[PDB]
Coordinates of C-alpha atoms in Angstrom, one line a residue:
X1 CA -26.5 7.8 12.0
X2 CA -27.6 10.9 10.4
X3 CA -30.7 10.8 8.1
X4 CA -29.4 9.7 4.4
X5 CA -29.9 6.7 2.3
X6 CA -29.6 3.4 2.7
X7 CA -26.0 1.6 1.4
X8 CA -26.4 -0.9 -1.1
X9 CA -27.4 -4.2 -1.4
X10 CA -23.8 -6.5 -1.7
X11 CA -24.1 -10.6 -1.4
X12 CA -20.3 -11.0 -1.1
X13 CA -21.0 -13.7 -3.5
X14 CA -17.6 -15.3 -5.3
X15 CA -16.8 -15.3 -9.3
X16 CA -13.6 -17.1 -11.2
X17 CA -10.4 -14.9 -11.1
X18 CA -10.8 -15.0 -14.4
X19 CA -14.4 -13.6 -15.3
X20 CA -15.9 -10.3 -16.0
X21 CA -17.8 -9.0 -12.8
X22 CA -16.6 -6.0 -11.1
X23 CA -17.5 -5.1 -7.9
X24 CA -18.6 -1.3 -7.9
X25 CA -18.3 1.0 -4.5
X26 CA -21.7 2.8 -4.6
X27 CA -22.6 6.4 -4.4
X28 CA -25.4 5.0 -1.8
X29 CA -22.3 3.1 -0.2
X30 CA -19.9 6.2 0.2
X31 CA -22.5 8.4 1.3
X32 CA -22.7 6.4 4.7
X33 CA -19.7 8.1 5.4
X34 CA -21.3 11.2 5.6
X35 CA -24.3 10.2 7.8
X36 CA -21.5 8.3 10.6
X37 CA -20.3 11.5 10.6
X38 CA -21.2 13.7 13.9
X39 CA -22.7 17.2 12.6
X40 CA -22.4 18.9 16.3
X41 CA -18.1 18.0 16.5
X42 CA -17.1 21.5 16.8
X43 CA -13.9 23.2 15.1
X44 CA -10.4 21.4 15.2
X45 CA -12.0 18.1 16.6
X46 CA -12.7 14.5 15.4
X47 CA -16.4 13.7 13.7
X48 CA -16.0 10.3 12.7
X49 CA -16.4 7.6 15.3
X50 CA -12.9 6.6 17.2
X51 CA -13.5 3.0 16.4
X52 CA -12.8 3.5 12.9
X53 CA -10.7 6.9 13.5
X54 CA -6.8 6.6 13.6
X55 CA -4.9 7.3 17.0
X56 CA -3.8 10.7 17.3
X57 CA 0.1 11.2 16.0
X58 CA 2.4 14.1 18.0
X59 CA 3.3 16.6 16.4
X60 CA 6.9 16.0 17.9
X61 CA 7.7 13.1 16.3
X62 CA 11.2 11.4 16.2
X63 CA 12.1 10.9 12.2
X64 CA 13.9 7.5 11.1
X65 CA 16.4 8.4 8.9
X66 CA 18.0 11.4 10.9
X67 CA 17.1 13.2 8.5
X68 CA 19.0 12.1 5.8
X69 CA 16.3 11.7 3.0
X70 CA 12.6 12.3 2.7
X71 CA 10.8 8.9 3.1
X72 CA 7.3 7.6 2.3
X73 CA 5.4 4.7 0.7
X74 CA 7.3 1.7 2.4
X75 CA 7.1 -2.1 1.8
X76 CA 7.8 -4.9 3.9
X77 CA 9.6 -8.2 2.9
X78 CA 7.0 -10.9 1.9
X79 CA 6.0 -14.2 0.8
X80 CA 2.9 -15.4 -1.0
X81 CA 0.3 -15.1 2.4
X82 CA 1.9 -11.4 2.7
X83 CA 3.8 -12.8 5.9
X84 CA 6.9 -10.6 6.6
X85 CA 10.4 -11.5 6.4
X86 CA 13.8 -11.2 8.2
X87 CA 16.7 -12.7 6.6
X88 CA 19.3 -14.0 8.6
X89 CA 18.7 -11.8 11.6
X90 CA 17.8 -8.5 9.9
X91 CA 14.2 -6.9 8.9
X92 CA 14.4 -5.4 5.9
X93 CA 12.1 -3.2 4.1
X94 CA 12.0 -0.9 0.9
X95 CA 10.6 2.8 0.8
X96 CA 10.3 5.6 -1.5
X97 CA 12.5 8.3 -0.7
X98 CA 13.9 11.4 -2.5
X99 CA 16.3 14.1 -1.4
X100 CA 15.8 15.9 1.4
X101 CA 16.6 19.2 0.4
X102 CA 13.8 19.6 -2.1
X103 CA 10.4 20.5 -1.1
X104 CA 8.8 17.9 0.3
X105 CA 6.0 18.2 -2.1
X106 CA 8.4 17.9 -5.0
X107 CA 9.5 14.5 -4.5
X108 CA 7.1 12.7 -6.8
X109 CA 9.4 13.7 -9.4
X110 CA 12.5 12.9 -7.5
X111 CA 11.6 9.7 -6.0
X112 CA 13.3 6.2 -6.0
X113 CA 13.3 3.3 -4.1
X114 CA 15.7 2.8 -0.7
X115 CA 16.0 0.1 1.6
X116 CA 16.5 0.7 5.3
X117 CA 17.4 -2.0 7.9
X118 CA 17.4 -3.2 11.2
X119 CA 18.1 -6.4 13.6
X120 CA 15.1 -8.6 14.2
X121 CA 13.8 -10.3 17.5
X122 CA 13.9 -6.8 19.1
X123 CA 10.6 -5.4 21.1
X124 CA 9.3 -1.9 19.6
X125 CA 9.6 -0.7 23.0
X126 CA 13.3 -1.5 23.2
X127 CA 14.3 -0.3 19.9
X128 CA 15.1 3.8 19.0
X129 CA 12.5 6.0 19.7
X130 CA 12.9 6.8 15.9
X131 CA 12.2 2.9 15.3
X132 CA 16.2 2.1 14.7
X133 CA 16.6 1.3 10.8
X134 CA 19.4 2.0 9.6
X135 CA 19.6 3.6 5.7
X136 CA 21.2 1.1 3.4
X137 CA 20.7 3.4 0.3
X138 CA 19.5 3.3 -3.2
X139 CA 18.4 -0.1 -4.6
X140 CA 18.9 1.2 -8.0
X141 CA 21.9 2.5 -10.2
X142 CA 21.7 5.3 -11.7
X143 CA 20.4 4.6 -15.1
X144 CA 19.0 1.2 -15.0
X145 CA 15.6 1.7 -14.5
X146 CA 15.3 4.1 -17.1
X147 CA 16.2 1.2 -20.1
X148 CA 12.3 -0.4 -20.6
X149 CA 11.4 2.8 -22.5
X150 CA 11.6 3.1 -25.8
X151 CA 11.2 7.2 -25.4
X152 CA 14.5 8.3 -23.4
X153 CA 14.0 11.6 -23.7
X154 CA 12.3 11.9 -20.6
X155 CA 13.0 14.6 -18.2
X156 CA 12.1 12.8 -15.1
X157 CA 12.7 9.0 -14.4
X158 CA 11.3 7.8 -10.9
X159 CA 10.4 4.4 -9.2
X160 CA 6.9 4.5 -7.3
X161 CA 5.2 2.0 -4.8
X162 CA 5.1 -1.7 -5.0
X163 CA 6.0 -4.9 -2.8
X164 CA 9.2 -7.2 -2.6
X165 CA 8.4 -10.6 -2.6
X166 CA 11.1 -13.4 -0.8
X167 CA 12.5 -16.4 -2.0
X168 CA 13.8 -19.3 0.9
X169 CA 17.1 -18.7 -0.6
X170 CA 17.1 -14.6 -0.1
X171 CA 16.0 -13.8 -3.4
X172 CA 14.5 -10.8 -3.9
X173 CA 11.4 -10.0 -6.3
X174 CA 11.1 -6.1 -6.0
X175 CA 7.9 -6.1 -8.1
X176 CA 7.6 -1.6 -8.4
X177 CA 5.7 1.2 -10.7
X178 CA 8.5 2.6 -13.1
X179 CA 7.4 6.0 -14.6
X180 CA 9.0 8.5 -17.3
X181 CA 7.9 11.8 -17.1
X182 CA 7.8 14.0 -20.5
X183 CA 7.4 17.7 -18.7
X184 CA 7.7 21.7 -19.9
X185 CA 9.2 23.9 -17.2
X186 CA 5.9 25.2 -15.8
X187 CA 4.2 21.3 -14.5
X188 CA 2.5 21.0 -18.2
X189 CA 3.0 17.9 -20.1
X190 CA 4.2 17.8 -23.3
X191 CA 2.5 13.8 -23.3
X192 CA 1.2 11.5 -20.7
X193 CA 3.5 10.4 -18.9
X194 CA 4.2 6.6 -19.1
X195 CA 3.7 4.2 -15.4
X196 CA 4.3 0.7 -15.7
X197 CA 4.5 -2.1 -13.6
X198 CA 7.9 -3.5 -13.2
X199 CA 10.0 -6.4 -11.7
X200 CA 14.0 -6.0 -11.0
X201 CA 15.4 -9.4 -9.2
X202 CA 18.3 -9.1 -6.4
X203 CA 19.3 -11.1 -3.1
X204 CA 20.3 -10.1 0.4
X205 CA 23.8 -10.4 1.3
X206 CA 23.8 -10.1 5.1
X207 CA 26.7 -10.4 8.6
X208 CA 26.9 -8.8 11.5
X209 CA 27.1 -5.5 10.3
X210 CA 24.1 -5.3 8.2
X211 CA 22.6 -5.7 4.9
X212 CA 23.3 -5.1 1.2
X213 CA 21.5 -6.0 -1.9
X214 CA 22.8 -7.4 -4.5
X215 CA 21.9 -7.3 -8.4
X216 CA 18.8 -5.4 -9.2
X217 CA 20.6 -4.5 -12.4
X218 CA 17.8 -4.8 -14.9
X219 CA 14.5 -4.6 -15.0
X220 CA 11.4 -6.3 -16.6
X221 CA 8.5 -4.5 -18.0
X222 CA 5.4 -6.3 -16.7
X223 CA 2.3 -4.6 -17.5
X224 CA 1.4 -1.0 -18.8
X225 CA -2.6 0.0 -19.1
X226 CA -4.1 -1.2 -21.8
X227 CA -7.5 0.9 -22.6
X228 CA -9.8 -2.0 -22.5
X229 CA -9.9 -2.5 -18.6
X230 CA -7.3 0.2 -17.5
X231 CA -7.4 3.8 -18.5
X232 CA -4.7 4.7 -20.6
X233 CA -2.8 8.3 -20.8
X234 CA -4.6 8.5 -24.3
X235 CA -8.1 8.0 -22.4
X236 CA -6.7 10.6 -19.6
X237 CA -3.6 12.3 -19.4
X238 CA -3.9 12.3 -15.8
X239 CA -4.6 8.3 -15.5
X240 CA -3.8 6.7 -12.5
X241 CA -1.6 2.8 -12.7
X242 CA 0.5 1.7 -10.1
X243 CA 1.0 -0.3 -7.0
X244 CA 1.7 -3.6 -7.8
X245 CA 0.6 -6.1 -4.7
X246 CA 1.6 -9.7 -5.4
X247 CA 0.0 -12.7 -3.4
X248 CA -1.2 -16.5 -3.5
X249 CA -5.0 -17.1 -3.5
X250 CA -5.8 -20.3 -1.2
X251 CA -8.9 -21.1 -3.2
X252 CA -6.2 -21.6 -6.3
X253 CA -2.9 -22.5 -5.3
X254 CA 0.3 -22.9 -7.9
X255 CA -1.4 -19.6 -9.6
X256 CA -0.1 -15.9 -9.0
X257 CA -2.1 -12.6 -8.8
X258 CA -1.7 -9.1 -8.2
X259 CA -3.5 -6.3 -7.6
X260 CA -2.9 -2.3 -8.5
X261 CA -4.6 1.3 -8.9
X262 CA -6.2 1.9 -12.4
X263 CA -8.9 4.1 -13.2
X264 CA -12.2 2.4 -15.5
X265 CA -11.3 2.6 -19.1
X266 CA -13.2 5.9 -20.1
X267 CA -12.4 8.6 -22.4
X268 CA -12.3 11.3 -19.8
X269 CA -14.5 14.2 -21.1
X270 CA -17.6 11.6 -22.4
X271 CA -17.2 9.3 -19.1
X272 CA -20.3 8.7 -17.8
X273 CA -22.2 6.4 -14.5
X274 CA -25.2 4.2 -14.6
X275 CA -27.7 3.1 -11.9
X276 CA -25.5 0.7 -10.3
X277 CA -23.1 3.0 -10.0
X278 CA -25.1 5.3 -7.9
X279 CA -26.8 2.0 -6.0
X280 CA -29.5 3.2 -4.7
X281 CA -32.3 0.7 -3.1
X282 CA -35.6 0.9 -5.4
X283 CA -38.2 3.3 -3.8
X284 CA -35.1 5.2 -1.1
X285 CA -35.7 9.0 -0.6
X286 CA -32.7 10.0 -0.6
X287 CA -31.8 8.7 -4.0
X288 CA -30.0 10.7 -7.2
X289 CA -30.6 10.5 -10.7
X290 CA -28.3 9.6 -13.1
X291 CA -28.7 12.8 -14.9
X292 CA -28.3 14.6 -11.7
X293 CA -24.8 13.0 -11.1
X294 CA -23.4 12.8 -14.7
X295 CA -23.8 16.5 -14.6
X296 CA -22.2 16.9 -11.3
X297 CA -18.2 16.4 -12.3
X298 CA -18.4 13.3 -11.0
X299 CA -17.2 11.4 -13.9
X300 CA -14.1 12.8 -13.9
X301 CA -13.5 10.5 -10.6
X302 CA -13.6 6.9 -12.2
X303 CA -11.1 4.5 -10.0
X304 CA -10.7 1.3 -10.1
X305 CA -8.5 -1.8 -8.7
X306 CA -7.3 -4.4 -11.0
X307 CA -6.4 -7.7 -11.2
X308 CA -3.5 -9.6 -13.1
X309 CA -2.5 -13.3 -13.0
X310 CA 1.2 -14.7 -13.5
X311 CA 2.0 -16.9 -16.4
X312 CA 5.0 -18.7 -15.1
X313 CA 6.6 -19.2 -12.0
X314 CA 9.5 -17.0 -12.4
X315 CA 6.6 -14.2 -12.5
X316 CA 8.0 -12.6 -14.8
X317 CA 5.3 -12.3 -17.5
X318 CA 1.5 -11.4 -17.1
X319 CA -2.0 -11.2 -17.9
X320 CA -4.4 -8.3 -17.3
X321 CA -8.1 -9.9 -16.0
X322 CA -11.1 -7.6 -15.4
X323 CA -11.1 -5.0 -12.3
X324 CA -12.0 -6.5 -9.1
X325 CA -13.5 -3.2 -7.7
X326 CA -15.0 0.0 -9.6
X327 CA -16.0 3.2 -8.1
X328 CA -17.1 5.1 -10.7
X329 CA -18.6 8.9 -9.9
X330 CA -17.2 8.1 -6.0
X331 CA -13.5 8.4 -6.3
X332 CA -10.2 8.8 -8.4
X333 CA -8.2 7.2 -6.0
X334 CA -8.4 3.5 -5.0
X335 CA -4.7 3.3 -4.5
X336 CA -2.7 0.9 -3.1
X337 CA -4.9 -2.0 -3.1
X338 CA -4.2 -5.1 -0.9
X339 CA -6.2 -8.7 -0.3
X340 CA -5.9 -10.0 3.1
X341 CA -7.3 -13.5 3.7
X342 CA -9.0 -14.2 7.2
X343 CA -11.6 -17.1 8.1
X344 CA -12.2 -17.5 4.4
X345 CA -13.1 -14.3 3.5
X346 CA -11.0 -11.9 1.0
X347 CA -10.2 -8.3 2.3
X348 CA -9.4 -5.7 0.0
X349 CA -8.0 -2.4 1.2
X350 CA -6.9 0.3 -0.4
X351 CA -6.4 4.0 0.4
X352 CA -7.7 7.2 -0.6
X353 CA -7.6 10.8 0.0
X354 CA -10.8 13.4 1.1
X355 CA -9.8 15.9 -1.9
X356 CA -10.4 13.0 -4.4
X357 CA -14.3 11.9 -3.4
X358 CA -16.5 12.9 -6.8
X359 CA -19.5 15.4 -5.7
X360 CA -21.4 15.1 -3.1
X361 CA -19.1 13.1 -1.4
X362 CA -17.1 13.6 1.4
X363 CA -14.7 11.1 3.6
X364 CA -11.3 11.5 5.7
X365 CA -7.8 10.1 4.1
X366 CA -7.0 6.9 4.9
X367 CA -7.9 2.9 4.6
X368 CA -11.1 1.9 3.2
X369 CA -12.1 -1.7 2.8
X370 CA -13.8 -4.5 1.0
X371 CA -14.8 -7.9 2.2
X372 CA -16.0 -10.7 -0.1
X373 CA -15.8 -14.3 -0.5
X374 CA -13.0 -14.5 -2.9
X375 CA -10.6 -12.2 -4.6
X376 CA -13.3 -11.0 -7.5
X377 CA -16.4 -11.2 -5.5
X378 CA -19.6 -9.0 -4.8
X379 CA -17.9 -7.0 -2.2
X380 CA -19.4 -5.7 0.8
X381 CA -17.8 -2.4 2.0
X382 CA -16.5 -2.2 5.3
X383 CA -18.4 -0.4 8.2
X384 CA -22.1 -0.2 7.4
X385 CA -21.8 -0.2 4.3
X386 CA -19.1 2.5 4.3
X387 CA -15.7 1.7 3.2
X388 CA -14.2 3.4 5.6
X389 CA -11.9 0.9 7.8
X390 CA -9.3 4.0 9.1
X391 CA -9.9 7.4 8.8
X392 CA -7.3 10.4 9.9
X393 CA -9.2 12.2 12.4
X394 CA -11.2 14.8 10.2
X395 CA -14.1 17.4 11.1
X396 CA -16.5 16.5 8.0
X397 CA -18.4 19.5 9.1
X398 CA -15.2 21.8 7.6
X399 CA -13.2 21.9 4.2
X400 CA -10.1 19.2 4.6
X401 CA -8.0 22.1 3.2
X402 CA -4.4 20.7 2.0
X403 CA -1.1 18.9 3.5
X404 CA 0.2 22.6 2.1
X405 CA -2.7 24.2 3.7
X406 CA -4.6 23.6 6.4
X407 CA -8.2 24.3 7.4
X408 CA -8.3 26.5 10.5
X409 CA -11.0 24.7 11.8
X410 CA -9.7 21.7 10.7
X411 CA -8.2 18.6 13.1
X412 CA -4.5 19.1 13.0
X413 CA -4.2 15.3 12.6
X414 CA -6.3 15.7 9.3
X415 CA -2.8 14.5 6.7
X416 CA -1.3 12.6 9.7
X417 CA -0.9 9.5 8.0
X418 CA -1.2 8.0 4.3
X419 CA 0.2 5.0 2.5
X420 CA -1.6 3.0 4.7
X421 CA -0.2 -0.9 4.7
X422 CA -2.2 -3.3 6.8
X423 CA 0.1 -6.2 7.9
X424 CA -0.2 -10.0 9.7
X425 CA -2.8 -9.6 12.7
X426 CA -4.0 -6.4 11.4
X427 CA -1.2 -3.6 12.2
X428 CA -1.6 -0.6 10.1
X429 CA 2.1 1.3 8.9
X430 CA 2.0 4.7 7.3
X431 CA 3.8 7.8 6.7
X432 CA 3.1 11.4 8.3
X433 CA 2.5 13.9 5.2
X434 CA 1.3 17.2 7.5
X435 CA 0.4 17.4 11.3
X436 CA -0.4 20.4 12.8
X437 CA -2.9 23.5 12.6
X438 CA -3.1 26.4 9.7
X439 CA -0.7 28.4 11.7
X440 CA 2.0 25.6 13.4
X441 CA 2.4 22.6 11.1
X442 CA 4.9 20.3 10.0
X443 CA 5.8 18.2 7.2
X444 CA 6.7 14.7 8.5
X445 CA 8.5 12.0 5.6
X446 CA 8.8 9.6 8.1
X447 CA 6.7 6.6 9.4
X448 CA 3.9 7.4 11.7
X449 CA 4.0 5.2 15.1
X450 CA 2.1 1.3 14.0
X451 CA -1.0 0.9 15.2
X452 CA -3.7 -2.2 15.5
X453 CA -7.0 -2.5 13.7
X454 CA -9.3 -5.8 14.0
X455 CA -11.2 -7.3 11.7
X456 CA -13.7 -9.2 12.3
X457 CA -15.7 -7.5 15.3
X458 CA -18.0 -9.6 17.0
X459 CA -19.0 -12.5 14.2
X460 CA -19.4 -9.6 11.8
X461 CA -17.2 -10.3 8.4
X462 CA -18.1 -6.4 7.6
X463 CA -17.0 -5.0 10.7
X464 CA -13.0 -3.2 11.8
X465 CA -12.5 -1.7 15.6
X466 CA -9.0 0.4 16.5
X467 CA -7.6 -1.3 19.2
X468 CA -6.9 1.7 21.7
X469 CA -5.1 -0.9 24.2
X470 CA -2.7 -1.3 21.8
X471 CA 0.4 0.6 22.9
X472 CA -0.2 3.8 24.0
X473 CA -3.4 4.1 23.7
X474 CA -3.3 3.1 20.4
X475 CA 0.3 4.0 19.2
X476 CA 2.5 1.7 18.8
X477 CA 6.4 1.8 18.3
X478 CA 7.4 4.9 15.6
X479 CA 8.1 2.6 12.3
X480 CA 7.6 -0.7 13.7
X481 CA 7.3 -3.0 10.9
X482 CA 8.0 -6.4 12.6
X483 CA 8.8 -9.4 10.8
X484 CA 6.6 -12.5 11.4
X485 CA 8.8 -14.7 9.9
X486 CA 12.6 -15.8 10.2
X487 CA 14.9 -17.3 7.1
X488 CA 18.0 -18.8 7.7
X489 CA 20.4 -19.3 4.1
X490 CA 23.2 -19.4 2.8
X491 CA 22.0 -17.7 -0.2
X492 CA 21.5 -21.4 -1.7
X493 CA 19.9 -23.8 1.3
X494 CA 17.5 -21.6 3.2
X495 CA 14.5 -22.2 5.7
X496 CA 11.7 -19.8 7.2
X497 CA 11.3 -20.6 10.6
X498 CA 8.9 -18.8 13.4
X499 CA 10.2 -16.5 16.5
X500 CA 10.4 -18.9 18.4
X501 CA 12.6 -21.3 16.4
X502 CA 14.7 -18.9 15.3
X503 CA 15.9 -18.0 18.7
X504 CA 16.8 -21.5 19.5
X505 CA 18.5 -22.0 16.3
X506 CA 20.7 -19.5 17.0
X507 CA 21.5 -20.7 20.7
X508 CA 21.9 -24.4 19.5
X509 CA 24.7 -23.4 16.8
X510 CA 27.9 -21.5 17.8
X511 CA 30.3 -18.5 15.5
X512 CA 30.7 -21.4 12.3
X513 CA 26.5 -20.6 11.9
X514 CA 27.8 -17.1 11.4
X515 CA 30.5 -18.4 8.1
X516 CA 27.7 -20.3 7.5
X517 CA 25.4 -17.2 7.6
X518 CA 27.7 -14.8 5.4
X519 CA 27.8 -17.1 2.4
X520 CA 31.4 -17.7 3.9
X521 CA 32.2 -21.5 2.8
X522 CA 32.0 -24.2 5.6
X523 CA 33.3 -28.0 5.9
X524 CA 31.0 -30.3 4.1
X525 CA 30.4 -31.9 7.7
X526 CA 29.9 -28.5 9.4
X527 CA 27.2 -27.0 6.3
X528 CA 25.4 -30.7 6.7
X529 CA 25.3 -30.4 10.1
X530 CA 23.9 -27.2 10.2
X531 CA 21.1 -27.5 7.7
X532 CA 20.1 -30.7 8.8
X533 CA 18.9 -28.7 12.2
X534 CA 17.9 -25.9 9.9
X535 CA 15.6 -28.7 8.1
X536 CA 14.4 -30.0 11.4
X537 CA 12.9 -26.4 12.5
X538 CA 12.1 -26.0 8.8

């Protein structure tokens, strides 16, 4: 550690879903990513430590649609303990994508959600190089997901990140952020533009030559920020709300929450931090003033992660609570916020770029993390007292420079990977933006190989280690995204079922399972027969 002050005091301690205390991510906290840093890494190489540093991605990397569209942000299939689904054989998983023939930094605009595919049970090492999905399209027609506003006269209409939670019957929730874009020809506004979290229901139809989804025909609007807890566009034209993550909380079961990026609900220009905020131990050296900071620009980078509970099981209707996490004059960007359960404790990750750290703060992209004990708790950051959990390897002795752009004494691996996704026993999916140096790079729009982060080092709650046995040396398979779980249905009886049942399930059953399967009607002694064993592994 490098001389700098001490991160702050957290206690982890546990309050109702339901009350106001909000967690904050200190300026004392983020600054111990400055002082892990290694001020004598010289130019183009790693400064951050290689146990919370991502494995290095090549710079020839295989791409998993062929080419056929840009892809990024990608979801798995879930249930309500963010175990991962295949249905009837196949994996299944939803990404952003937009047309490959724009610039890939144009796609925001462009974007909408696709669905790619491939056949379960299969080791990464046996699959593709490129990972094997096969593209199954569009979720969305055209003009559906345009109909919750009430102001049509947008000129761009895209779908954004999310989560798709599973039904035991193949029912799909695709819970999403639907935006509408009001824009002049030169990237000006003519009013904020308008994200809101959204829910479209479909089903997997599925046979031996793949998947297609069903319905998805209209949408819900769910939630949209409402200025008391989320910023709204009125607050900040610029206002950050999206990512809806769904899940179950063990410590209240038959409830539904979510989590998603807002910002704190400031009027942008007369924003301002307090003492707690900053964090700072009484009596530390290295300790700012609040004048000091509010003067800084800081308080344009107010983020937050919020919280919402279901109001019926159909989740189809919801209530904002109070933010879970703040952190106020230390980032923008929370984004994609997740809460992972292990031994009892709550983890909350969450991603965020370098550019978007408020003064006199620095870290690389990637996951930073939060454990507590429960889902609105005193959180502890991850790592010292850092946040960080997975970094892109980053020199913090030079300027980050820009996917667009980069720093010529820069690590080339700097925008390697973002959209970060921890999933069951801690494997870490993302998407390549840029990989290379200022004069060879690359833009990717494709999934970076999986790797394996652990939680829980030694006893410690508060630690994360990269597992560099994993793989190859700490690369996994290229868009591995493996299913944990297995249902079987007929789109009416179904059953979720482990690896290990599902492959003698499909041994002990002959070719009527597959009429069976297809939604293909049975005899009544054949369909009995079949879900009786079905109920048996069930």
């Amino acid at each position: 550690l490098q001389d700098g002050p001490e991160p702050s005091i957290h206690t982890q301690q546990a309050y109702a879903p339901e009350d106001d205390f909000t967690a904050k991510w200190t300026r004392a906290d983020a600054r111990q990513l400055q002082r892990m840093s290694d001020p004598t890494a010289p130019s183009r190489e790693n400064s951050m430590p290689a146990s919370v540093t991502m494995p290095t991605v090549p710079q020839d990397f295989p791409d998993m649609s062929n080419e056929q569209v840009w892809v990024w942000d990608t979801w798995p299939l879930t249930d309500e303990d963010a175990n991962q689904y295949s249905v009837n054989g196949w994996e299944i998983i939803f990404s952003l994508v937009a047309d490959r023939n724009l610039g890939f930094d144009d796609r925001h605009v462009f974007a909408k959600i696709g669905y790619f595919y491939r056949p379960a049970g299969v080791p990464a090492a046996e699959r593709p190089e490129n990972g094997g999905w096969t593209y199954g399209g569009l979720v969305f027609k055209e003009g559906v997901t345009g109909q919750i506003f009430e102001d049509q006269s947008f000129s761009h209409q895209t779908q954004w990140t999310g989560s798709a939670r599973v039904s035991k019957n193949g029912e799909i929730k695709l819970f999403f952020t639907d935006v509408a874009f009001y824009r002049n020809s030169d990237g000006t506004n003519i009013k904020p533009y308008d994200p809101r979290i959204a829910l479209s229901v479909g089903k997997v139809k599925a046979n031996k030559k793949g998947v297609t989804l069903t319905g998805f025909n209209k949408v819900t609007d769910l939630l949209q920020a409402d200025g008391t807890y989320y910023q709204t566009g009125a607050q900040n034209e610029f206002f950050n709300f999206r990512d809806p993550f769904t899940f179950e909380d063990p410590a209240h079961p038959g409830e539904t929450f979510m989590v998603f990026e807002g910002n704190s609900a400031m009027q942008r220009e007369t924003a301002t931090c307090n003492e707690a905020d900053l964090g700072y131990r009484q009596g530390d050296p290295y300790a700012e003033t609040v004048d000091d900071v509010n003067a800084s620009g800081a308080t344009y980078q107010i983020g937050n992660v919020g919280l919402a509970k279901a109001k019926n099981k159909q989740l189809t209707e919801w209530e904002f609570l109070p933010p879970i996490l703040s952190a106020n004059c230390v980032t923008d960007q929370t984004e994609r916020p997740q809460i992972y359960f292990k031994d009892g404790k709550s983890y909350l990750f969450t991603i965020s770029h370098r550019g978007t750290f408020a003064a006199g703060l620095d870290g690389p992209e990637g996951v930073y993390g939060f454990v507590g004990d429960g889902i609105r708790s005193d959180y502890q950051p991850l790592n010292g007292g850092s946040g960080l959990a997975l970094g892109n390897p980053t020199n913090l002795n030079f300027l980050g420079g820009q996917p667009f752009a980069p720093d010529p004494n820069q690590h080339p691996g700097h925008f390697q990977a973002y959209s970060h996704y921890v999933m069951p026993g801690g494997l870490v999916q993302s998407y390549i933006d840029t990989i290379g140096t200022h004069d060879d790079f690359v833009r990717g729009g494709t999934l970076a190989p999986t790797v394996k982060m652990d939680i829980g080092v030694g006893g410690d709650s508060t630690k994360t280690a990269v597992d560099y046995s994993y793989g190859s040396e700490g690369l996994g398979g290229w868009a591995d995204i493996p299913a944990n779980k297995h249902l079987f249905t007929n789109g009416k009886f179904g059953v979720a079922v482990s690896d290990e049942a599902a492959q003698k399930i499909r041994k002990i059953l002959g070719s009527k399972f597959d009429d069976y399967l297809d939604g293909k009607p049975v005899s009544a002694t054949v369909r009995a027969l079949i879900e009786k064993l079905l109920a048996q592994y069930g």
